[PDB]
């Protein structure tokens, strides 16, 4: 039993700080309260941590999500007992649905008061069970480093996700009197190898392969690089899921852009005509596949003839052969396994016919929307198209968050995606209000990046109180509101006056001819800014 | 025996019809795909006022305010996934404070459950610990049954939130088959065994107060869960000349103008109260749960009362509806199970009309005198005291002669409201007590205003609390609710106390311009910065037609 005395004499609060440092955390999103005070005071008073304060705990959660997606690091959330904890249920479920690394620390009533219906107090472990990968209540200060290390390890491994650590006030305020095992203080087969070889064989055999890439490739820093490398080496066209946008440069000649029900027809056609589908960190969602029996007939036929089919690089065993029957499953981290596979891949000089057919499709079936005519209302797709161009022309690194609704899909389709970790949107849970706090967190993660929230009026209304949080945090986020307003009529506030009340510059566009100028002013504006564009209804 | 009246209807139409059977005239909710078959059948109908928030949490707290102001259950209609998770906080709030609330959540089709579908959440699992009961409806036939069970459970025993999960295929489906009449009708006879068991404990306590040496009425929220609660409390207080103190949640149940009033008790109550719960021998607990900030460390309070519990002098009578809550905190000597109000009526006759105890109206009737509710009143030129704002507002509101309802946020202003407002009428103080949810004030005020359209509704809020749910400002305007939003702005002091003298804070949130915010949201904004403008602005605040926000810059000190 190798024992450690280095935390003896410290409070749980300081121990928490040290553990945060060991986990390479320098940013925490949260909101104070009595039960979490011993930890909050330690974090708040240390210049080693940027503590970001929202107006509502839900904001803290969504900020952490945006931070995680932008940085690849886990988002750390620190809230109090009862309502503090219940206010982060939505962001936890959101992170759980989208596979986002998040560690949620919740203050709790003292261990002596558990289950007496004390002031605040909630069965947070019970509430959050189905919306976390794992949760726990820390029972003693001795146990605090162990649970923190476990939480972070679980949150950042397999498919990433939210974990919750319940922290009773008496535990965090207590001083460690006893040495603890050294291990608890430190942060954290040939079938797989056979599968990698076989997948290399199939790829080398394929005449019309397609790479089908999702969010999983983003869960490792080297993911997109190895994806690009495999695509170049074997000359394989690449299509992405909505959550995979950014993982592959859409200006690359081999990009098929987005796959699925709302994707480019060329991408869909490529997939239906491929003899091999190489699925990398993707879930085979029905919005991507459509009717599963009609999906990838050329791949099915190739599998039946033993010359192709489907390869699935998937980290979770439970997702293997859950939707589609695969010929080869490569279990584990996609990036890691792509790296091991690379040297076994035959360098292909060209696939002239395959790319010729693809490029013909690109001519025949581009995206199409009822474009603007003189004197007509502005089309939301046009705003997004123009803004993408304007944003790129800045030469800056650009990150995009969205709310939930038609604008979300339009952003996915009509924006030109070039860099990884630049599309931050609520896909699995579809949480309205996501855009603004996610942008703030993303901006904190990437202070030099231009961060744009493409939002709808209804979604924006959900969390608009966080506008003041953006000013306070010094995050110069660019908020875009595409305002499209029997039916359901919601009374909107004056968004420009609202922004001004919150401390931001506010801009508005009603007519087609003032759009280009305002878009330039919007992006060029220093500090946070809201631009409302009055827009045509679908 | 079989009901056929619903044959041919969609689940949405059946839901609509079932709301009528439950006497629902108001639904608070927000649309989404999974709940669309229900939403459409309701949102258009003129049998129900459908109130829309900007955020589902808003709908939840609105339902709470509605419920506490009306005595009717608050009905919530939200969609699957994030719509459902967004009402967890209001459910936990309603669970802690015993508030009747029926939550209907849309859900993915039954065939999609467990496939990690779009906007799928294990809502039944999530809401388990913060509801009295929940269920997922699995067929249209089952729909009226679960609705009826929901409303009965929410409004029975200690009232509370229930959740009913509604798969889209169930609510979109058409009922083809008759269902048992028992399942479509909402829900009394008692046995002579039950009656005697009750009446025994009743008279066993009736003579104990007929003893009546040093008696005190400890009244809580339970007395408000029956319409005849306060009145039967009033005349009981008269009959035996019994002084009355209330919990935070019992405020309004007894007139504080009355000489027999002791006002609030606890670690924030009037001194004449907590001390008269020492000098008392018979503590008559009515609808209160002996809370950690009403009770101190259990050892002390109440010693001299316990002296009765070793002399047969008296002790603790506990009128409680949940037997599970008897002797779970404080060992009682007599327990009267059931509805407090009902048992008070049954005990009324067996009470000896006493008209004096003046040795009692002495130790206490003096007692203030020493200790009132001391706070450093402001001096010319100095900062505005929050207690003063509340005192003056109470007067201004009272001058209108209107029924006044007060909601609050959570924090110092919440206690100041409780302490310094003068409480007269039942169901007029609507505050988050058990969970202490910041952001409660505004949406609760809106819901309360929908429940009581003629009432003057005031939200006495804090700056940080108000920031939590301020988006519902636009919802107030859309709904027409002329709520009076008071913001006691002490932003200069931090939210977090780091240390303090025996007789210094950090964390300052950046507030928006609240007056410009109000205007952007479509309502009137007023600001007080100086003592000299306070009176005129408080009057304009109360007199103004429509929704209005008043910010008062107050003393960060105390
Ligand atoms: C009306 C509607 C229309 C839609 N239209 C489309 C559309 O046209 N196109 C589209 O793409 N989406 C569309 N969506 C969204 C779609 O439903 C899914 O949310 C999305 O496609 C899922 O993307 P994903 O599979 O890449 O991410 P995920 O759901 O997160 O799946 C990632 C997979 O990779 C695995 N994984 C995670 N980490 C790793 C790792 N390190 N190594 C290996 N594997 C890993 C995960 O276990 C998971 O199985 C639509 C949604 C709606 C509601
Ligand atoms: C910042 C803050 C400070 C606070 N400090 C104080 C303080 O100083 N003083 C104070 O009093 N409170 C204080 N509290 C409030 C405290 O947390 C509790 O909410 C409150 O004390 C409980 O009051 P209650 O027992 O009357 O209501 P409840 O907690 O709702 O208890 C009601 C009891 O009556 C029972 N009951 C319900 N209905 C019936 C019925 N029909 N018939 C019979 N029985 C019934 C219930 O089962 C329950 O046992 C504070 C709250 C906050 C947020
Ligand atoms: C008691 C408690 O748990 C308080 S009081 C309080 C600050 C109140 O600020 P406000 O300005 O609104 O009130 P003021 O005191 O009068 O200034 C906080 C952060 N909390 C914790 C907290 C945190 N988050 C939420 C959702 N609810 C609560 N109760
Ligand atoms: C919290 C929450 N409530 C409800 C929904 C259901 N919902 C999905 S999109 C939408 C309307 C959003 O419209 P908007 O935000 O303005 O974007 P738009 O479709 O107009 O582009 C709703 C209510 C949701 N996804 N999340
Ligand atoms: K594109
Ligand atoms: K009072
Ligand atoms: Mg919209
Ligand atoms: Mg304040």
């Amino acid at each position: 039993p190798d024992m450690d005395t280095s935390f003896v004499g410290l409070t749980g609060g300081q121990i928490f700080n040290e553990m945060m440092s060991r986990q390479n955390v320098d940013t925490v999103f949260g909101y104070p309260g009595g039960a979490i005070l011993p930890v909050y005071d330690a974090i708040h008073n240390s210049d080693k941590f940027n503590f970001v304060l929202p107006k509502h705990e839900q904001g803290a959660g969504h900020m952490a999500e945006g931070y995680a997606r932008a940085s690849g690091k886990p988002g750390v959330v620190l809230v109090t007992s009862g309502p503090g904890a219940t206010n982060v249920v939505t962001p936890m479920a959101d992170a759980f649905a989208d596979g986002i690394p998040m560690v949620v620390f919740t203050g709790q009533v003292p261990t002596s008061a558990i289950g007496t219906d004390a002031f605040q107090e909630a069965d947070v472990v019970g509430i959050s069970r189905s919306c976390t990968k794992w949760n726990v209540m820390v029972k003693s200060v001795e146990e605090l480093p162990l649970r923190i290390n476990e939480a972070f390890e679980i949150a950042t491994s397999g498919r990433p996700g939210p974990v919750l650590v319940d922290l009773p006030k008496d535990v965090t305020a207590a001083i460690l009197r006893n040495p603890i095992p050294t291990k608890t203080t430190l942060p954290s087969d040939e079938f797989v190898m056979q599968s990698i070889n076989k997948a290399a064989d199939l790829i080398n055999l394929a005449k019309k392969p397609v790479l089908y890439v999702g969010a999983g490739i983003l869960n490792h820093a080297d993911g997109p690089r190895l994806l690009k490398e495999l695509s170049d080496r074997a000359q394989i066209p690449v299509t992405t899921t909505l959550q995979g946008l950014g993982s592959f440069d859409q200006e690359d000649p081999k990009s098929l852009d987005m796959l699925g029900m709302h994707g480019c027809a060329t991408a869909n056609l490529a997939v239906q005509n491929a003899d091999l589908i190489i699925a990398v960190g993707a879930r085979f969602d029905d919005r991507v596949t459509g009717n599963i029996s009609k999906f990838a007939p050329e791949a099915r036929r190739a599998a039946a003839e033993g010359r192709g089919g489907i390869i699935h690089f998937e980290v979770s065993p439970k997702n293997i052969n859950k939707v589609v029957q695969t010929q080869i499953a490569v279990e584990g981290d996609a990036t890691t396994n792509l790296g091991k596979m690379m040297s076994k891949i035959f360098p292909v000089k060209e696939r002239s016919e395959w790319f010729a057919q693809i490029n013909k499709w690109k001519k025949e079936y581009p995206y199409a929307y009822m474009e603007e005519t003189p004197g007509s209302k502005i089309k939301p797709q046009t705003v997004i198209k123009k803004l993408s161009k304007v944003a790129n022309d800045t030469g800056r690194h650009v990150i995009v968050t969205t709310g939930v609704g038609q604008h979300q899909m339009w952003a996915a389709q009509h924006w030109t995606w070039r860099n990884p970790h630049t599309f931050i949107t609520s896909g699995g849970l579809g949480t309205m209000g996501y855009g603004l706090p996610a942008a703030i967190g993303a901006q904190v993660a990437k202070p030099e990046s231009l961060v744009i929230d493409i939002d709808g009026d209804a979604s924006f209304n959900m969390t608009l109180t966080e506008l003041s949080s953006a000013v306070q945090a010094g995050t110069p986020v660019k908020i875009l509101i595409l305002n499209n307003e029997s039916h359901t009529h919601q009374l909107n506030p004056d968004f420009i006056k609202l922004a001004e009340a919150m401390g931001l510059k506010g801009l508005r566009v009603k007519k087609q001819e003032e759009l280009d100028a305002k878009l330039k002013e919007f992006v060029s504006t220093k500090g946070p800014v809201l631009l409302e564009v009055e827009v045509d209804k679908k």
Side-chain angles (χ1 to χ4, degrees), chain A:
Chain A
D2 201 329
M3 299 294 280
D4 183 41
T5 57
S6 65
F7 291 165
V8 176
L10 297 181
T11 59
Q14 280 307 313
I15 288 172
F16 182 94
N17 275 20
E18 179 59 40
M19 295 311 302
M20 291 302 108
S21 283
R22 296 192 182 190
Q23 291 288 346
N24 298 310
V25 175
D26 61 11
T27 306
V28 177
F29 306 86
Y31 202 96
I36 197 51
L37 272 200
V39 181
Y40 174 82
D41 286 339
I43 288 287
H44 180 268
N45 301 332
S46 173
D47 70 346
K48 290 167 169 60
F49 308 97
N50 179 17
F51 193 93
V52 184
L53 177 82
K55 289 309 194 302
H56 190 295
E57 288 88 354
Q58 183 191 1
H62 290 321
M63 286 169 194
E65 291 187 274
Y67 178 90
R69 288 243 217 148
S71 68
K73 302 168 64 65
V76 183
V77 176
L78 185 66
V79 299
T80 194
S81 60
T86 59
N87 280 346
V88 304
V89 169
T90 296
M92 284 190 298
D94 192 279
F96 190 79
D98 278 342
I100 304 173
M102 177 193 282
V103 186
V104 179
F105 295 102
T106 53
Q108 180 59 275
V109 301
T111 55
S112 66
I114 300 285
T116 77
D117 306 281
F119 176 58
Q120 323 239 290
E121 186 195 7
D123 186 11
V124 184
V125 157
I127 292 173
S128 62
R129 190 178 315 286
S130 71
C131 60
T132 57
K133 298 186 56 173
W134 180 76
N135 60 24
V136 69
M137 178 194 297
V138 181
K139 311 276 187 171
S140 72
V141 67
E142 288 81 4
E143 184 193 340
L144 185 54
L146 173 66
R147 301 314 195 180
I148 289 171
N149 285 325
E150 285 175 348
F152 274 84
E153 176 182 357
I154 292 172
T156 61
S157 66
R159 186 189 193 224
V163 300
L164 182 139
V165 179
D166 211 24
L167 298 173
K169 194 184 183 184
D170 56 336
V171 167
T172 56
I175 287 169
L176 178 67
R177 303 292 181 180
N178 298 313
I180 58 182
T182 308
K183 43 185 173 300
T184 75
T185 69
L186 296 171
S188 312
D189 197 317
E190 54 195 0
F191 182 85
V192 166
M193 197 57 251
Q194 171 179 104
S195 291
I196 291 177
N197 280 315
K198 284 203 173 306
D201 285 336
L202 262 189
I203 295 172
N204 292 342
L205 176 67
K207 293 182 175 64
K208 299 190 272 190
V210 176
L211 273 157
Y212 161 52
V213 184
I217 197 58
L218 293 178
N219 291 331
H220 190 295
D222 293 319
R225 179 175 64 82
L226 295 188
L227 170 61
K228 168 65 169 154
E229 192 183 348
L230 174 61
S231 177
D232 291 333
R233 187 185 176 110
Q235 289 293 288
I236 307 176
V238 177
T239 184
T240 70
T241 63
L242 178 135
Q243 296 292 344
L245 295 171
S247 71
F248 194 81
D249 194 345
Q250 291 191 334
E251 283 186 358
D252 193 288
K254 295 184 290 296
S255 178
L256 300 165
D257 291 16
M258 198 177 68
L259 184 60
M261 189 189 184
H262 295 258
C264 255
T266 297
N268 287 320
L269 284 169
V271 165
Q272 297 295 84
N273 284 277
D275 60 345
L276 180 66
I277 293 177
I278 313 162
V280 182
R283 209 245 314 286
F284 291 97
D285 191 82
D286 54 32
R287 296 296 178 180
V288 169
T289 63
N291 188 280
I292 198 54
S293 55
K294 297 185 184 184
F295 176 74
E298 277 301 280
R300 297 189 191 282
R301 182 170 75 86
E305 299 174 5
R307 58 174 176 79
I310 300 173
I311 301 168
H312 200 178
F313 288 84
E314 168 62 45
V315 75
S316 296
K318 60 239 69 174
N319 287 21
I320 293 173
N321 298 314
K322 183 175 183 179
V323 183
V324 303
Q325 184 58 41
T326 70
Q327 281 53 64
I328 299 174
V330 187
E331 189 174 330
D333 176 63
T335 303
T336 299
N337 289 328
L338 286 176
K340 293 178 177 179
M341 173 170 305
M342 276 289 313
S343 67
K344 308 161 182 298
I345 296 299
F346 179 77
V348 175
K349 181 195 174 185
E350 73 186 26
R351 300 183 191 274
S352 297
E353 304 183 19
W354 186 217
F355 280 99
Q357 176 59 264
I358 286 174
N359 287 319
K360 184 162 81 69
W361 283 333
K362 279 185 174 188
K363 283 180 178 288
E364 298 179 347
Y365 314 89
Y367 269 144
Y369 64 98
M370 306 264 294
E371 280 152 30
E372 326 199 331
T373 67
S376 326
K377 261 299 179 191
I378 303 180
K379 302 299 185 184
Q381 300 87 331
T382 303
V383 182
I384 297 181
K385 270 194 174 188
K386 284 166 170 281
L387 181 55
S388 186
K389 170 71 141 46
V390 170
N392 178 81
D393 284 7
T394 64
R396 302 181 66 196
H397 183 259
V398 184
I399 298 171
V400 168
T401 69
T402 77
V404 171
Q406 302 181 102
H407 63 278
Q408 179 176 28
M409 191 50 57
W410 286 329
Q413 294 172 320
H414 300 288
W415 191 272
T416 306
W417 306 106
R418 307 208 60 205
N419 301 312
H421 302 272
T422 61
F423 194 27
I424 306 184
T425 186
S426 181
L429 191 64
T431 306
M432 287 172 68
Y434 186 79
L436 171 58
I440 297 177
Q443 184 73 89
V444 169
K446 296 285 173 179
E448 296 312 310
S449 291
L450 170 65
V451 184
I452 300 164
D453 167 30
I454 294 174
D455 224 331
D457 48 308
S459 284
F460 182 75
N461 270 294
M462 289 252 169
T463 54
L464 53 70
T465 189
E466 303 299 349
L467 284 171
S468 63
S469 298
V471 177
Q472 181 175 10
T475 57
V477 292
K478 270 59 184 174
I479 311 303
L480 172 68
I481 314 289
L482 302 173
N483 188 4
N484 50 14
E485 272 224 334
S486 183
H487 310 342
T488 165
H489 189 285
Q490 286 286 82
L491 172 66
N492 281 324
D494 187 322
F495 293 121
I496 274 62
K497 289 180 179 176
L498 170 61
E500 294 172 359
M502 290 282 176
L504 295 77
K505 185 203 264 184
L507 298 170
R508 186 181 281 120
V509 180
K510 293 185 168 186
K511 305 192 305 175
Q512 302 184 23
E513 55 269 24
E514 26 170 15
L515 179 57
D516 287 288
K518 290 292 184 188
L519 283 181
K520 289 191 176 57
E521 179 181 4
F522 181 49
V523 169
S524 310
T525 298
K526 271 166 172 40
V529 56
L530 185 147
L531 165 62
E532 176 189 5
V533 178
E534 292 188 353
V535 111
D536 199 339
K537 188 74 190 71
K538 172 255 183 176

